[PDB]
Structure formats: C-alpha cells, structure tokens
Design a protein around this ligand. Structure first.
Ligand SMILES: CCCCCC/C=C\CCCCCCCCCC(=O)O[C@H](COC(=O)CCCCCCCCCCCCCCC)COP(=O)(O)OC[C@@H](O)CO
Ligand SMILES: OC[C@H]1O[C@H](O[C@H]2[C@H](O)[C@@H](O)[C@@H](O)O[C@@H]2CO)[C@H](O)[C@@H](O)[C@@H]1O
Ligand SMILES: OC[C@H]1O[C@H](O[C@H]2[C@H](O)[C@@H](O)[C@@H](O)O[C@@H]2CO)[C@H](O)[C@@H](O)[C@@H]1O
Lengths: 370, 370, 282, 483, 370
C-alpha cells in the first residue's frame, strides 16, 4: 500500500541509467513520474512492478522488502502502455483473467466484472474481442482489468498516451475521480507535464534516470530546483535569458541584460554561494510577463509568430540580442500582426535564476498555493 | 536411347564386377573403346524396365532362368556364335541359353548352392537336416550357433523344399508343362514345415538375410552356411578355416538346388551389337578373361571347357558340381520369373508365422497357374 | 530481467535434463552411423562402439583406392563426391529458380488487383496435392520429347530434374504472399509518390525487406530437392549424373551390402544442408 | 526488340511440332507460348507478367503430367503394352535372323583406299574385294583368289575406328548370298526378320508367317490362311480400367482399408510433430534458459540429414532379431518387438521415425511464429500469477493454432503422400493376404498405386494405376472444394 | 499549387463515407483537416494524394483535373503518419529516394540532401539508418523527404501524432516558421484542435464524413456553425446546457435553464427560424464564465475537481440540475478546496445557442478578430 524506494539502482552491465535515487510514497498518494522519453519513467515503474530486477538498493511495498519478491505477489497491479489485452480472449475473460486462474469462483467473477463494467461503461462490450473495440474502449478494458484485481498499489504506464487529444483530456478527469473513489496508491508514468500537474498529488521529475525534483505540482511550478525542472513544467516553455551577475546583496541579486541597452534589475532571490561576473540564465514564464505600459522594465522586438488560440493568445518576439524568440501569453484575443513591433514588461518578483550548473536559486518571492 | 561408341555392362553386385572391368580395360587398350561395368540394385527388375524404352546397358548379366521372360518381351538380341565358338563350351550350357530354338545369351559359369562349414568348429558337418537341431543345441551352449543362411530369397530355401518331391514345372518328355506345378505337394509342404520347425525351436530367425548370414560365418559365429561360389572370395579374406561340401539331406532325400547358368545377353536396342559380340566371345569367354573375373569372385564351374579342366582340381568346385548334379537345372521359360515371386512370398510368410506351411504354399500354387 | 519465483531452478534445472536427455535420444541414430563408418568390415551387424578405428570406409568415400593385405587394391565403388556436387547443383539452382518464380507471383497476388486471384491460388494448392510419384510414366514421356528439342533439359540431364522441380510453388507463393500482406503499406505508397515503378518498388523496397522469408523458402526448397527421390531417380540414368538421393541406394544391395562404405558417405551427405543452416545464422 | 528474336523460335520449334507428328505436344507448346508473348508485349497486362513465369511451371511440370496421366487411365498402358504403335513396328523391323554362314574378314589398306577379304571354312576357298573407299552404304563383289593381298592386315583398333562405314558395306560372294559385318573379325549373312509392304501387314522371312496389328489387345497376331508377337504397343481402352476398380473384389477390399491408415498416419504425424515441435520451441526460446544457441543447432541436426539416408539408417536399427535398437530393448525390458512383421508394430515404427523426421520443421516454424506474440502479454500474465503450464495453455497454445492451421493442413497433405518414407523403410510393411494386387499393411495410397504399376511380378498395369490415381485426386479435389 | 475539390465523394461498395464535399484552397495556404479518429481527415488527404480512388467528383491541383493521374505526377508530397522511412536505407537515402531513382544526379543529390538536412538539423545522421534514430528525428526525416522533393503541394498526416508533449509543441513552431519561409500550399491532418488553431490559416472541420465548417481558426472559435464545431474547439470542452426557448425577439432570444431555479436570460442571437418551447443547448466556454460577484445570472454548486495547472486553474462543479460538471477556467492560481461550494456568472453576451438539429443560432454579438 505504501511504496518506498531506498538507493534503488538499475544498470545494464556497466551503463548506469539510474543513479541511487530515493522516493517516499505514502498510502493512497497519487504519484506521477514525468520526463522525456527514455528518462527511466518506465524502468522505475517496471522495477516497482517487478518486471525488471533491482540491481542495487531496497524496495518496500507495505513496509516489507520486495526486491526478490515475484511481481504477482507484490500486492500491485499494472496497466500497460499497449493495453496488453489478450487477443484471443473476450473483454470479460480479459478482465477476469487475473483471478480466473488459481481460485476459480464462477459466481464471484460475474460480479466483480459487471461491477467494474458498470463504472466504466463496458457492459455492452463484454462479449466482444479486443480487436472489435476502439483505442478509447481498449484503453478502458486495460484499466478495468486491474480494477477487478483490486490491487493495493496501482501502476499505470502512459495510459492516455495513445488516444485522441480530446479523449485524453476527458480521461484525465475520469482518472482523478477514480482515484478519490478508491483512495489507493497510484503510480502514473507520462511525458505530458499537463498530466502530472492535473493528476499528481506528488510529482517525480526525472532527467535521464536521475530525479531532479519531488513534490506537489503547484510547488514544482513556482519553485523549480534547477533549469530542467523549470524548462519542463508549463504549457509553453519558460523563457531563458543569458544574463551576467553584477551586484550581490543578502536580500536579493542583480544581473545584466544581453541587450545593447544594458539594463539592470534586482531580483528577490537567494544570494548564498553567488559570485559577480557569473554567466546565468534568467527564468520568466510567458504568462507572468506584463504589458509594456505597466512595468518599467521594457523589452521590445519584432513579432515572429502569432498563435490565436481563442481562449488566449501566444506571441513570439525576436528581441534584438537573443537568438531565443521571447514568448508572450495573455488572455482573450490580442489584435497584433505578424512582423509589427511589440513590447512587454518584465516583473522582477516573478523571475527565476539559475547558476552555471543550472541549479536554481531559491525564490524569496512568496507564491500563492504553497 | 542407348549411347553408341561404348559398352555399358550390367552384372549382379554379388559377382566379380571389378574383375570383369579389368577385362574391360583390355578391350579398351585393344579397340580404344571404353567399357563401363555397373552393378545396379535389383537388376532383374531394373533391366526389363529400362530396356523396353530403348535404354539400359549393352550387355546384361543374369542366370539363364530370367533370360526366357526377357527374350519373350523382345528385350534381347539373337546372338550369333559360329560352330567354332559353340564347341568351346559344354553343349548343355548352350541349352540353358536356348529359347524357342534361338540362342539368346552367352553362357559363362555354372552356379549351384552348397553347404559351407567351419572346420575348426565343425570338423564333421551333418549329412542330414534332422541332425542340425541336435547340433544347434551343442554349438549354441558353446556360445555359437549351427546354420545361418539367407531365408528371404527362395533360391536359398528351395533346396530343402524341392528335396522330398517339390518341383517348379513338371517336365514331360519334350516341353515344360506350364500347368503341372509341385510347390503344393506333400513333398514341398513337409519340407518347408521343417524350415519353420527350426524357426519355432529358436534354431533360426525368420528375418535372417544374406548380409547377416555372411557376417555370421565370416566372423566365426555360426558353424554352417549355404551359399554359391561368389561367396568364397570373402571367406578367403576372413581367414576362416572353412570347407565346401554336399548339401545335407532331408528325410533321406538329397537337397535339390536349382542350377543357375550365369549368362550374358545383348540388349535388343543397342547400337553396339558388333562390339558386344566381340567382347564376350574374344575377351570375356577366354581363359584370361574368365580368370580375371574368377580371381575377383568365384564364377563356379565355367562353361568354357578349356578353363573348366584347369579349375576342376579345386575341391570346392568339385562339391559345387556335385550338388549341381544332385539338384536340377533351372528352366528358362517366361514363367520362371513369375515362379520366383510366388515362392518368395509363400516362404517369408510361412517363415514369419503369418500363415502356416499349407496356406502359404497353396497361395503360391494358384498364383503361378492363374 | 523479470523477478522469478519458486526457486526457478526447480523447472530450469529439470529442463536442462529433459532437453539433455532429448538430444541424446535423437542424436543416437546419427552417432550410430558415425560409429559404423569407423568400424572395420562392411557387415550389417557389428559392435556398437568399434574395437579399433578403420579409415577404409572414409578413404573410398573420398575416392581413394585401398590396399588390404589380402585381395590387392579395391577401388572406390561410387563417385560419392561427384554425386555430392550433383545434389548441391540440382538443389541450389532449383531453389533460386523456385524463389524467383514464387516471389514474383506472390508480389502480384498481394498487391496487384486482378479478378480470379483467389480462385487461382486455391486451384494452385489443390493441383499440387497430387503426388508427382503417380506421374513418372507421363513425366518420362515429357522429358523424352522435350529432350531432343532442347537438349540440355531432357532425360539424363541435371536441368531436366531442375525444371521438373520448378513446378511446385503453390505453397511457397502463399507463404510469401502472406508475408507481404504483413509489411507496412506506407513504405510502398511513399515509394509510389517518389515515382517508383511497381518493379522499382519490388526490387528497391519490398525485396530487401523480405530477405528472411526468402531465405526460409530457399532453405525449405533446398532440403526438399536434396532428398527428392522418385522423380530424380526416374530421369537420371547415368551413374556419373546420379544425385546423392539416387546413388546412395546402390550401397545396400542385399547380396552386396556395403554398410560401412555407405555409412561414411552418409555422414558426408549431411554436409550441404548443415552448411546452409550454419550460413543461415545471419 | 527481343520480341522478334524470341518470336522467331515461335514457329521455328512450333512448326517442328506439327511436323514429325507429335500432335500431343504440338498444341500446348504454341498455346502456352503465345500467351507469354501477348502478355510481355503490351503494358495493359502488367499484372500477368509476374504470374506467367510461375504458372508456366505449374502447367508444364505439374498440371500437364496430371492431365496426361489421366488419359493414361483410358488405356491398357502396361509393361507388356508400353510403346506406341509406330515404335513397336520400328523395333520389330530392327531385329534380324542369320540365313547364311560365317566368314572371317580382314581389312588391308591399298594406298588411300582399303580392301576386304573373307574366308570360307567349309570349302577352304578365299574371296577378296576391289580397292574401295569408306563412307556410305555400298555393295561389294568378292572374287575368288589364291594369293595374299599386299599390305599388312589392319588391327582391331583400326577396324574399330572404321566400324561405321564397315557396317554399311554389304558384301556378297559370287555364288553365296549377301553378307555383312557381325563382329570385328567376322562377316555373316544377316537379313531382316520381317518386311512391311503397302498395308500394315508384317510377314516373317524364316517360317513365312503373316502377322497383323491386333488393336483389340495392342499386339501383333497371326490368323489361319495363334501366335502373338510380344514387344507390344499401347492402345485405347475406354473405361475398362475404371470399371475394374468398381468391379474387382481383391482391389476394393484393401483400398478402403489403407485409406484408413493413410488418413490416420498423417493425422498422428501432424499431431505429434506439432506437439513436440511447439513444446521445444517454447523451451528453447525461453528467456531464463542458458545455452539456447547450442540447443537450437542440436535439435535441428536431424533436418540437416537428408531424409532417405536417415530412413535407411533407421531401417537397419529397427531390425527385429538383430539391429542395435532391439539389442538394448532386450537389455532393460525383455522384449524384441517385430517392427516389420506385426502390422501395428510396423505402424508404430513408421510414426516413431516420421516424428523424428518432422519435429524440427514444426519447431523452426513455431520458433519464428512464436515471436509474433508481444512480450507484454506474458508480462501481464505474470502479474496475475501465471505458471509455465498456465501460460502455455491459456496464452501460448490458443494463440499459435490460428496461424498454424494452414501449415498443419498443408502438413497433412504432405504426409498423406509420403511415398519416400514407406517405400524405403518398409515398402508396405507386412504383407496383406488374399489380394489380387500387391498391397502391404503400411502402404500409403500413393504406395499402393505405385505398387500396382512398377512392382515386378504381380501385374504391372500402368493403366489401372493411372485410373486409381485419377480416382483419388478428383475425390480429394471434391474434398477441398467443400472443406 | 492551389488544390480544390468539387462534389468530391468517396465510397466503399455501399457505404457512403463522404457526401459531395466542396473545398477551395488558395496558393500557399496552410489548410488543416480536423476531427476525431475515423472521421475522414486522412482519407481526404489520401484522395488528394491519389492513394485512394474518388468515387465521384472533381479534384483540381493548379487548375487541372487530378482524379486519374498517378500519385507521383500530382506535384504533391506526403509526410506519412508512420513516417514510412525505408528501414533498409540510410537517412540521406530516405530523403532523396525519389530523385535517386527515375534519373539520378550524384553531384546534385549531395547538395539537396545537405541543404535540407542543414535546416532540419539532420546533418550528423545522414549515414544512419531509421532503426537507430529516435522517434523525433524519425519525423524530421519523413519531412526532409518532401523538402528534398520540394513539391507544389505538401501533405501531412498527423505529423505530430506520436511525439512527446514537449516536442509536439516545439515542432508546431518549426512548422509555421517553415510555412511562411516556403509559402507553399499545405494540407494538414490532425485530431488535436490546438494544432489547427495555431498552424492553420483555414480550418476544415470533419464530422463523420461530412464537412461541418470551414473558416479561420478565430472565426471557427467565436462563431461555430453547429454544436459539433463548438464542442470540438477550445482547450477544454464548451459547456452545453439544456435550455427551453420561452420567447423570441428580432434582436435576441430568451431561454429557460433546467434548474428548479428556472432563471431566464436574453441571449443576443439570431432569432431566425426558432420556435418557443423548442429544446435547445446553451453553449458557454469555461474561459468565458465570470466570478459570481460581477454577473447577475449566477450558477452555484459543489466542486468535484480542482486542477492546479500553474498558469491557470480549472474547476469542475456539480450543479444540482445538470448531470454534467460545468467547467471553469481562470488565470494565475485559485485557492479552492475540492468539495467546497462555488458560484460563477453566466454572461449572456458570450453565449452560443443551438437548435434540435444542433445548428448554431448566428451570434449577433461582435467578437474581436473577425
Ligand atoms: C508429445 C508432447 C511431448 C513433447 C516432448 C518434448 C520432450 C522434451 C521434454 C519437455 C517436457 C516439458 C517439461 C516442462 C518443464 C518446464 C520448463 C519451464 O518452466 O520453462 C517454461 C517455458 O515454457 C514452456 O515450455 C511451458 C511448458 C510446456 C508444457 C506443455 C506440456 C504439454 C504440451 C502438449 C500439448 C501440445 C499441443 C497440441 C497441439 C494440437 C517457462 O516459461 P514462462 O517463463 O512461463 O513463459 C515466458 C516465455 O515463454 C515467453 O517469452
Ligand atoms: O531368389 C530368387 C532368384 O533366384 C535366382 O537368383 C539367384 C542367382 O541365381 C544367384 O546368382 C545369386 O545372385 O543369388 C540369387 C538369389 O539371391 C534366380 O537366378 C533368379 O531368377 C530368382 O529371382
Ligand atoms: O512431417 C514429416 C516430414 O517432415 C519434413 O517434411 C517437410 C518438408 O521438408 C517441407 O518442405 C514441408 O512440405 O513440410 C514437410 C512436413 O510437413 C521432413 O522433410 C520429412 O522427412 C518428414 O517426412
């Protein structure tokens, strides 16, 4: 029920694809592993599942060590990336398979199946074969199968990753309502920061087999640990500006803009272990950017792209002195042409800062939600 | 189509084919023409098939009995030996190669089965067949056995059968009465019964073939065997102290083996009839020719009278002609080849135990007459 | 590397034994021959394991005459090597021909639309169920006329036999057709838009992606011809043109049972396919 | 382009078919050729270009010999009655009889020219020719002489080299009759046995009998102003062969008896060959196993050994009284089973062997077919707690039969006509008693029909065998038009 | 380079997927076909490509009928859904395969491959094979092929369909930057409505084979022609409420909500062809709702789900009167507990209205950007 890892390490001979990493997951917590493809998300899930041996470290599920325990006896259950349905078996048989073997109970099965078929709308597909169903339905058969088994820990390997974008959105919600309807531990693997932010109680961001940061979604959004976490969470990517540190106070820090107009501004952030002349990256999210007539920190350039989204408007701007189109994000509709000059405001309080290595400086700007 | 400009000879694999080939080189050194000797399996059946289509060898080697069916089918060419040649051989050997008054083959040697015994083991070979079981018990309890010989072929078991009154076709002053057959009579039955009797009393194995019998004697495992001259060539190599003597008698009646006259026909469809004639008459049927073949594997008592007297001294050939006289010459009529099939089966089946003696023989009886 | 339960070995160890026992039971016959080919004497019967080795049988199998201290030099009875080369000819050439014919046909069935394509192949399979063995008479007749017109493919010719084997492709066509209908349609469609003619696609795109299935067909067809007996020994009359399958039977005349000489050549005859299976490790 | 050049053989060889008769092989060579030209020419038939070269093979070497073998059923084609009528007379005229004496000839060169001589043993007198030149049929007249010819006699090798022109020289004595070459040393008066005039009537030249082609039995026969010439020619016999199959008691009795054995034999084979093949394929590619690569090449060795030779080495091992199998089989157990005498024990043998022969094929098949199964099914299985036996029966097996069917139904037909195995191992095994035709207890339908045709001694009716063969095929063709 | 369709119809025997559809696409126009899975999107593209026959109608590309013209001769180029990268060929070969066959230019190819690989950043991979590349690189290649082909019309079949979220977004930019750079016609197939809004100059919405609506993304968003289009565009789905028409006026229409609190609101919308008592749906996007304090038409209930997205806050509320949790969407962050009571304002101006047949009552309120 309560899964926890201690210095878990997986290596294929010499190549270490997962440095000694620890994760503290609590009873019923909704946990999501995010990161780029191959970053080990599935490895970790499969290691918890027991589908992959743990080379080094210790693994506890229900507070007992599981390293050497067969997968079927870990009180766990998994939804596979490919649904992993039995082609030759009907939906009913596909779902009941689990307990169908060893412990055959005719009358008990019919129940559990119908019960989960009710909450997932699969009662009219119980006779059908995983070939006569749609990716959406086949995806519900996968979840249903593990729901019937009633495992203590749920393991899901990118369940929505292969569905229409519209169904995906809809299925995110259905999951959350399945989560609190059961209140059991769920481990959710995905590459979509949207899926992490919206489902996860606790989020585990992985960077090439290494944990970058752990915590609540809203915590990871405002206060990232390093440049990667920052650059991975959020609809449009966070803007990174090459800056040079100039002044150093205990309260805050100051950096220099790469423009011909060498402007300077103080940033309410950590000032421990910082030096003047260090080339750093300035972090600011498009949504937090302001209109020009408000803030006194002006940034003017040329509009390259105009993405009208209806609910909002996204604008990419070529700032003279940075080969990175500065991106702006506002509400409703912004009547602006492609190529016409445009200026925005830079809020110093809403800024992040990263060292040479990429490690972020603890933001001293209190944010709502933490 | 048979290729012109060379001689292809077919001779049974158990004859001295290699010796005969050296008679070929002689012919090639003299005429420049290459002689090919081959020894194809189941030749007595293979020849008829290929000859009918105009294919096959130039020269065919078998016992006289088969040459009657062949000549009738028109597969043979009427040979043309002048007076001078005919008188070089014994006149009765020409009688075996005479079909409807026409000469159809050149006689080579006289073949007849005998009893071959091991001196070192059996100094006193039996004169009767009844004293064999008694002898078997003695030799068996000495770690050996009594008499092993080919049971599969009728040629080898016919002696015992025809002994007490068995006969193929009754000869009525002049021609062969293709109706009067004695394979069913009291003499034939009581005789074959005895062979079955030996099988019943563990004195023999129904499945003993030529290859086993030959190995048994030539390795000193059995005391006696039954075989023609061609067999001595190997016993010579084995360095087994053996003797060739008269066939034991059954119920006072002496074994009556059929006498074969190894002959040579010219394929009716050969563009080499002129060279074929020269080879046989001036090369094979000479002293040296026959010697070359004899020095490979014993021909027996050759028809060429000049080389007969030279070879007459040999006690083995003396006993071979002794058993020949006791038995009767093989008929050549086109029913003889049909005669052997029926007997081959009758025996094997009676020997195996599928049928009793009478049932097995009464079958062969009506298969001949039809 | 999934974590395995119940001491695993219980079945893993008990399997190595079963497989180990199995190879022994099926290897036995083959080890019997090797033994017979090293046992002196040509007898049908002999001690299971030779008392002493004897190279004689292998000598005259390679074409060497052997001088026994008894009856002088006895030359090799049969050109085993020749026949060995013959078997590899008729089979090799035969197989390539068969793959060429059936991979072109399959390609047309699986992609090109032409009415009756389903009832054709269905008839193809059925007509192939008839035993070629029950034809020899009509087969002999065919290569008798066909022979004098086009010589190098009549009776007594290797080509004759080869062409005789080119008939059976129904089964292969199906398998290769079935294999094609498995590949991604896009790879071909994309090729079509690239301006490739159907053949250009067949060769440049489809074939290279099919190597494996062609290889299986080849091998299957190769082993087939190697062991084919009825037709081969019908058409081939010259000993020097016999294939292994024909000639290997001349060894066992009852009255001239060359069991040892035969055994040596037998081991040798298991060389061709083995080579193929070994080179098939690509 | 190449249309014209290969279109040149169209007519070149095609009209040569019409000429010299051969109407049997005259229509098919033109019809099956004129389609290839039509197809490969224009581009409106691009599809048939890939199917022509294939079906061409089917037609000639598979379909034809079948159609032909069927027309064979409508005739008495047999060992006795085999050749066509035109060859039968050609053979009968090619023979001859000696009507004179024998003369020893000699060849003596006279300049560039040569000279022949004979010698009469009865009269002692000698006869000699004039200087002639080798080449072509020529008659020579021999004159009596007392003197020796000038020039050393030619040795065999020289006369052998000129055997050609020497056989066409038909020399003749002044008083004696015509005399030609009979050997390398002898001339004799050889003359054709029969002569053929305007009508197809053959007349003997020794006994002076007249013979006529009896198309009722396909032989040459004589009538009073009876003998039967026995080279024999094939002739048509309507439905005579078919009617005998539906008539004869001795043919029908075992016919439906072996029909059982054949269908059973190939069923048990297919069932055992799959069973083993599959089980092994699983074990061998099982992840947790060690030496897969070695195990693999080992369990395939039987397939790398040509069938016939394996059958043969077995045939010996399975000997009843001797042969290494029953040696060891009487060591532990006290039995020596009769693998060749007892119908069943023989049948048991066949299968023990055939299984040894067929398993690799099914294993290789399953090995490749086994990878069509996505690993994650077994991973999802192992989650629900599935053991090896549970996997095999609930996942592996029912997931392999679907793709396996077409191959095992095909493997049924292969083993249905497994001629090589039977003929070699047993050749029909133990004998069936009371049969008007040859029949064993382990014969297959192909074997039984082959027996009737080619097995010497016991009727060799190619027509009857062609009939039964045709009878079977069209019934299995009806079976496959419903299954 | 100006594709257009007239009365185009595809059929499958008897099934009529698409009814005569008309599409006019101008030069260098970026067109996107959008809809759910299996709606026809792909078939259209594949019919324009010629990979799929046209049962009835006329297809013109550059003012000439293209129905029967072989695919290769359409001036069209396709980026396949599976990339269709020839596995057995190198990256460089994959992109230049078209112009390698049918006339080659060794020297030339080099340039075209290199130039296209310079812009797509496939330089260091030219010599590599498809099976070695990442799924992302494997897309850029599938593009290059057409960029090396440089055709008049581009065809893309769900090109961003299988990339990661993060990558899918990054690519959309590279797509638009590539468009205006080349300025050539681009037909584009996707199920993700976001991609349609960002990339497309003209959108084509497909409903079960039928063309639902054609127009600019901003036009489609503000003025959907039916419930379908409305309920297919916008980040989250539009809220639909079962209302009953109570009164009609030339200038606007009035409807009654289904709540025990049967409020009634005047909506500024086409009155044309609407009857009183008619059952209709109220369209209202979650981004358009108001905090209770501002508006007067208030909807209130219990919060079921709260999605902390970071850049926004999405809230699903169980309104006691409609079994569909209304969705709300605001900026920055909104500190709300799930299960808490909440109220929002329904602004009449920003409301859509659809009849029984689901056709949209033309909105009379003017929106910015149309
Ligand atoms: C006549 C038939 C007999 C054949 C004789 C073969 C001779 C060799 C002796 C072998 C005897 C079997 C011993 C079994 C020992 C267990 C070994 C083991 O434990 O190995 C198992 C291998 O599977 C497996 O063969 C599972 C084991 C298979 C058991 C099947 C037993 C009955 C099969 C007969 C039915 C044939 C089907 C009929 C077809 C119509 C473990 O596999 P798993 O990890 O679960 O699966 C995962 C992977 O397979 C998937 O990637
Ligand atoms: O056994 C039937 C067989 O008998 C004779 O064959 C003998 C042959 O005479 C011997 O020379 C030697 O080859 O043994 C043979 C039997 O194994 C007849 O000559 C033959 O016609 C008949 O079929
Ligand atoms: O199953 C018995 C049979 O197996 C093999 O025959 C194969 C043949 O080689 C293939 O070409 C194909 O037709 O499948 C056959 C089996 O279904 C062995 O070659 C053969 O010895 C054995 O009888």
């Amino acid at each position: 029920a309560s899964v926890q890892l201690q210095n878990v390490t997986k290596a294929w001979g010499e190549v270490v694809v997962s440095k000694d990493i620890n994760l503290d997951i609590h009873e019923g917590e909704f946990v999501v592993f995010v990161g780029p493809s191959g970053c080990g998300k599935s490895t970790l899930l499969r290691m918890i599942a027991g589908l992959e041996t743990i080379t080094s470290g210790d693994l506890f599920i229900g507070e007992k060590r599981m390293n050497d325990t067969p997968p079927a006896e870990r009180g766990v259950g998994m939804v596979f990336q490919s649904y992993a349905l039995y082609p030759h078996l009907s939906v009913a048989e596909n779902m009941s398979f689990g307990l169908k073997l060893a412990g055959a109970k005719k009358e008990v099965i019919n129940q559990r199946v119908n019960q989960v078929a009710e909450v997932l709308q699969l009662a009219h597909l119980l006779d059908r074969k995983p070939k006569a169903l749609s990716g959406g339905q086949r995806q519900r058969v996968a979840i249903g199968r593990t729901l019937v088994a009633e495992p203590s820990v749920f393991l899901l390997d990118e369940p929505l990753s292969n569905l229409d974008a519209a169904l995906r959105v809809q299925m995110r919600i259905e999951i959350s309502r399945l989560h609190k309807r059961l209140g059991r531990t769920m481990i959710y693997v995905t590459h979509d920061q949207v899926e992490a932010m919206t489902l996860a109680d606790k989020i585990v961001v992985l960077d090439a087999g290494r944990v970058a940061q752990v915590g609540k979604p809203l915590e990871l959004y405002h206060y990232p640990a390093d440049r990667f976490v920052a650059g991975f969470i959020g609809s449009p990517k966070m803007n990174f500006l090459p800056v040079k540190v100039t002044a150093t106070a205990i309260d805050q820090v100051q950096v220099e803009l790469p423009m011909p107009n060498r402007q300077q501004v103080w940033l309410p952030v950590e000032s421990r272990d910082v030096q003047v002349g260090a080339n750093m990256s300035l972090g600011i999210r498009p949504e937090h950017l302001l209109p020009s007539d408000i803030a006194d920190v002006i940034l003017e350039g040329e509009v390259q792209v105009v993405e009208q989204l209806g609910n909002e408007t996204q604008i990419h701007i070529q700032i003279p002195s940075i080969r990175q189109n500065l991106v702006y994000r506002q509400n409703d509709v912004v009547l602006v042409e492609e190529g016409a000059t445009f200026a925005i405001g830079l809020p110093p309080e809403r800024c992040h800062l990263f060292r040479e290595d990429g490690t972020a400086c603890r933001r001293l700007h209190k944010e709502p939600g933490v | 189509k048979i290729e012109e400009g060379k001689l292809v000879i077919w001779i049974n694999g158990d004859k001295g084919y290699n010796g005969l080939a050296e008679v070929g080189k002689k012919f090639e050194k003299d005429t420049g023409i290459k002689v090919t000797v081959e020894h194809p399996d189941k030749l007595e059946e293979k020849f008829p098939q290929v000859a009918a289509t105009g294919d096959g060898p130039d020269i065919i080697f078998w016992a006289h009995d088969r040459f009657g069916c062949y000549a009738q089918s028109g597969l043979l060419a009427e040979i043309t030996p002048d007076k001078a040649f005919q008188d070089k051989l014994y006149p009765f050997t020409w009688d075996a190669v005479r079909y409807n008054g026409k000469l159809i083959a050149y006689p080579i040697a006289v073949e007849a089965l005998s009893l071959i015994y091991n001196k070192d083991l059996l100094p006193n070979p039996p004169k009767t067949w009844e004293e064999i079981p008694a002898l078997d018990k003695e030799l068996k309890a000495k770690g050996k056995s009594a008499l092993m010989f080919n049971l599969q072929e009728p040629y080898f078991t016919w002696p015992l059968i025809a002994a007490d009154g068995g006969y193929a076709f009754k000869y009525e002053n002049g021609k062969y009465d293709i109706k009067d057959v004695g394979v069913d009579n009291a003499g034939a039955k009581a005789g074959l019964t005895f062979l079955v009797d030996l099988i019943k009393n563990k004195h023999m194995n129904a499945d003993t073939d030529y290859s086993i019998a030959e190995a048994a004697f030539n390795k000193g495992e059995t005391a006696m065997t039954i075989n023609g001259p061609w067999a001595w060539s190997n016993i010579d190599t084995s360095k087994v102290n053996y003797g060739v003597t008269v066939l034991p008698t059954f119920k006072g009646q002496p074994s009556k083996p059929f006498v074969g006259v190894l002959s040579a026909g010219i394929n009716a469809a050969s563009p080499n009839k002129e060279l074929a004639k020269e080879f046989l008459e001036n090369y094979l049927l000479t002293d040296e020719g026959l010697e070359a073949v004899n020095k490979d594997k014993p021909l027996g008592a050759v028809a060429l009278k000049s080389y007969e007297e030279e070879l007459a001294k040999d006690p083995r050939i003396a006993a071979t002609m002794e058993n020949a006289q006791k038995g009767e010459i093989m008929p050549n009529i086109p029913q003889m080849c049909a005669f052997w099939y029926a007997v081959r089966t009758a025996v094997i089946n009676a020997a195996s135990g599928r049928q009793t003696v009478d049932e097995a023989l009464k079958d062969a009886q009506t298969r001949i007459t039809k | 590397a999934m974590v395995q339960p119940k001491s695993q070995k219980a079945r893993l160890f008990i399997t190595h034994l079963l497989l180990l026992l199995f190879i022994a039971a099926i290897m036995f016959p083959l080890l019997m021959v090797v033994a017979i080919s090293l046992r002196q004497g040509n007898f049908a019967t002999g001690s299971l394991i030779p008392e002493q080795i004897s190279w004689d049988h292998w000598k005259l199998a390679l074409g060497f005459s052997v001088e026994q201290a008894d009856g002088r030099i006895t030359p090799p009875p049969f050109p085993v090597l020749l026949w060995l080369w013959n078997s590899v000819k008729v089979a090799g050439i035969s197989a390539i021909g068969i793959v060429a014919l059936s991979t072109t046909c399959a390609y047309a069935f699986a992609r090109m639309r032409f009415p009756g394509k389903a009832t054709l192949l269905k008839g193809m399979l059925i007509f192939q169920m008839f035993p070629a063995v029950l034809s020899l008479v009509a087969l002999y007749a065919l290569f008798d006329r066909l022979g004098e017109y086009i010589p190098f493919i009549g009776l007594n010719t290797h080509g004759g036999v080869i062409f005789a084997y080119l008939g059976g492709i129904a089964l292969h066509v199906w398998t290769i057709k079935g294999y094609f209908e498995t590949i991604d349609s896009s790879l071909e469609e994309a090729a079509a838009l690239d301006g490739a003619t159907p053949w250009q696609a067949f060769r440049l795109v489809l074939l290279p992606l099919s190597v494996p299935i062609l290889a299986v067909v080849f091998i299957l067809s190769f082993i087939a011809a190697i062991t084919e007996v009825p037709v081969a020994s019908l058409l081939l009359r010259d000993v020097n043109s016999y294939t292994l399958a024909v000639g290997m039977q001349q060894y066992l005349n009852p009255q001239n049972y060359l069991w040892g000489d035969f055994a040596a050549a037998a081991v040798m005859s298991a060389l061709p396919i083995t080579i193929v299976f070994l080179l098939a490790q690509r | 382009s190449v249309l014209g050049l290969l279109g040149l053989l169209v007519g070149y060889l095609v009209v040569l078919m019409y000429a010299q008769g051969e109407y049997l092989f005259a229509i098919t060579t033109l019809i099956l050729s004129s389609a290839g030209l039509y197809i490969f020419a224009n581009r409106k038939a691009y599809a048939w270009r890939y199917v022509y070269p294939g079906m061409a093979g089917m037609g000639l070497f598979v379909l034809f010999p079948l159609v032909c073998t069927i027309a064979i059923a409508f005739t008495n084609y047999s060992s006795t009655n085999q050749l066509t009528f035109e060859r039968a007379q050609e053979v009968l005229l090619d023979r001859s009889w000696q009507a004179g004496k024998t003369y020893n000839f000699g060849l003596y060169p006279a300049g560039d020219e040569w000279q022949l001589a004979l010698s009469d043993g009865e009269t002692g007198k000698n006869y000699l020719s004039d200087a002639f030149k080798f080449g072509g049929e020529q008659k020579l007249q021999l004159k009596e002489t007392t003197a020796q010819p000038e020039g050393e006699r030619a040795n065999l090798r020289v006369i052998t080299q000129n055997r050609q022109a020497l056989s066409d020289i038909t020399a003749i004595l002044p008083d004696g009759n015509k005399v030609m070459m009979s050997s390398l040393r002898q001339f004799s008066g050889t003359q054709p046995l029969y002569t053929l005039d305007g009508d197809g009537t053959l007349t003997n030249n020794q006994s002076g009998v007249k013979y006529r082609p009896n198309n009722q039995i396909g032989f040459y026969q004589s009538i009073t102003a009876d003998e039967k010439l026995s080279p024999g020619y094939t002739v048509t016999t309507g439905w005579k062969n078919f009617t005998r199959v539906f008539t004869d008691e001795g043919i029908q009795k075992p016919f439906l008896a072996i029909f059982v054995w054949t269908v059973v034999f190939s069923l048990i084979t297919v069932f055992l060959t799959v069973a083993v093949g599959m089980v092994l394929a699983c074990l061998v590619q099982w992840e947790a196993l060690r030496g897969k690569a070695v195990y693999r090449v080992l369990l395939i060795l039987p397939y790398a050994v040509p069938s016939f030779i394996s059958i043969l080495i077995f045939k010996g091992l399975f000997n009843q009284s001797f042969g290494e199998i029953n040696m060891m089989l009487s060591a532990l157990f006290g039995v020596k089973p009769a693998w060749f005498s007892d119908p069943t024990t023989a049948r048991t043998m066949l299968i023990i062997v055939n299984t040894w022969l067929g398993y690799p094929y099914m294993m290789i098949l399953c090995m490749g077919l086994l990878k069509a199964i996505p690993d994650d099914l077994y991973e999802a299985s192992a989650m629900d707690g599935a053991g090896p036996f549970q996997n095999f029966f609930k996942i592996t097996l029912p997931l392999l039969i679907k793709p396996l069917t077409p191959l095992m139904i095909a493997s049924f037909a292969f083993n249905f006509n497994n001629f090589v195995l039977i003929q070699l191992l047993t050749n029909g095994g133990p004998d069936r008693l009371g049969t008007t035709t040859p029949a064993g207890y382990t014969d297959l339908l192909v074997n039984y029909t082959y027996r009737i045709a080619f097995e010497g001694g016991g009727g060799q009716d190619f027509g009857l065998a062609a009939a039964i063969a045709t009878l079977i095929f069209l019934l299995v063709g009806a079976l496959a038009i419903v299954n």
